[PDB]
Design a protein around this nucleic acid. Sequence first.
DNA 1: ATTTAGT
DNA 2: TACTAAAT
DNA 3: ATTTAGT
DNA 4: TACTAAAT
Lengths: 255, 255
Amino acid sequence: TWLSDFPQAWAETGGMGLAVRQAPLIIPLKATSTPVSIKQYPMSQEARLGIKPHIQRLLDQGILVPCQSPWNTPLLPVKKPGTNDYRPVQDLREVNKRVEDIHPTVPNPYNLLSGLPPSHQWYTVLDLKDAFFCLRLHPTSQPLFAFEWRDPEMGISGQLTWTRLPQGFKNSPTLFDEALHRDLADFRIQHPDLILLQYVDDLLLAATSELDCQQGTRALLQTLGNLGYRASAKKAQICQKQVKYLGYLLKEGQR
Amino acid sequence: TWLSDFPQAWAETGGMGLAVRQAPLIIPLKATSTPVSIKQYPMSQEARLGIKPHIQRLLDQGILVPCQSPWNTPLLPVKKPGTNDYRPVQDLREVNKRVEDIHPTVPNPYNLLSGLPPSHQWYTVLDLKDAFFCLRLHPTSQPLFAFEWRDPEMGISGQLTWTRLPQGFKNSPTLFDEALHRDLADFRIQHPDLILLQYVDDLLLAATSELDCQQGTRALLQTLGNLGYRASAKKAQICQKQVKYLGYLLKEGQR
DNA sequence: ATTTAGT
DNA sequence: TACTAAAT
DNA sequence: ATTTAGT
DNA sequence: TACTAAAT
Ligand SMILES: N=C(N)NCCCCNC(=O)c1csc(-c2cscn2)n1
Ligand SMILES: N=C(N)NCCCCNC(=O)c1csc(-c2cscn2)n1
């Protein structure tokens, strides 16, 4: 009955997240960078029709906003299965080349897992939903990620850009991991007996007994929801002794 | 007038050479070797007509003799310039693979030249003619190099083989260099004031004054001819201060 | 004629 | 993933 | 659509 | 010396 205990913490009930304690992110550019504006490649109606609903949802949620910017990168129509449905995938490579590099602080899954003590057998795995979108972008950095969006049927002006940390941006993973580490620091101090591994949006809480787990989990959920993040209730693996995290299978603490 | 002083030493006058002091060479095979007999590839009349005179000359000189052997390698028709004339080139690669390896004792031209003192400025360069053919092959090793030779116009039996060290045989260069070193040892002891470099068939005698050179050269020629070797009178560079040896140009002793 | 070693 | 080029 | 990294 | 295959 976890769903009914933490509506704010779940994506299926708390709505879109927004990390209220995190200041809007400023993205520093390299010393020699100037705006790059690559024109939108013509897109078929089929792809444009597939992509449309996603953009509208994003504008509605305010994750995307109209803007005029000297920066512009191409939106790409992508779909995984055969026919499948199209989804927007922005080509931010030229933006990435002009953005100052930051130290990669996210540890590889292998090393991250070696920090799990044999005693802690009870697990809980959460996957934050739309993690990056929870992080805001400073208005000064927003123009950087603009792209063209023309609707052949009464098309909104021309460009749109993100008000949240975007997908495709080389530093998003690291910036999200660090921001979340800042927000979960207090939680860590309040529960020294718990083991929490963070891999960007993939979380693993390891306790010692079904009790500490249910108590630590409720605390973690309550903390996450309170901060503005949202977990997938669907893929949630709560208080178990065998979970699937970062590809590995943690049974009796072996993998 | 060197020609008239040493008829025995020159190829253009002394006839074919034959190292009288060198015992017929025995060629040891590797421990697991058995005869290999590759059939002769059909040869065009044009090539066969070109090659014929050479084989006849060789049979006449006794350098080639009829034989029946479990060994056989293909004779190849080769010519350098455009139309050019064909000359026999035996493919002895399969024979080479079955012949025991010997230490490579011939020094590279670079190292060989570093053994020339700055004081010795007078040079004399000789190139032995048909050097390998001067070395005999023990009758027990002769069968090893057999090849097929059929004459569409009354063809001599079938196979022929060499009675001298052959071309194409991987160890010929080294075996010739060593054999010649054995024969020129005494000469070296009789002329300690002379510098003699040996690179298989390419010889360089370095003295100090036009006198020691003319005296050393006459001695060397007389010794070479006496032993059965023959030098090319045509390409001979006698008592000079600037000669062409092993590719380099030795002027004032620089290259 | 075949093999090797490179491009 | 092929056509040289050389060497016997 | 472009780029990269391999085969 | 080309056609994948992936990744944005
Ligand atoms: N393992 C296998 N089954 N391989 C089969 C065929 C390999 C062919 N490689 C080339 O043609 C090649 C390589 S470099 C090159 C080349 C050409 S002009 C300048 N460089 N051509
Ligand atoms: N410097 C230049 N101007 N280069 C021009 C063209 C190079 C082409 N390389 C291949 O096709 C290649 C290499 S490996 C390979 C391959 C194929 S199927 C399995 N492996 N194909």
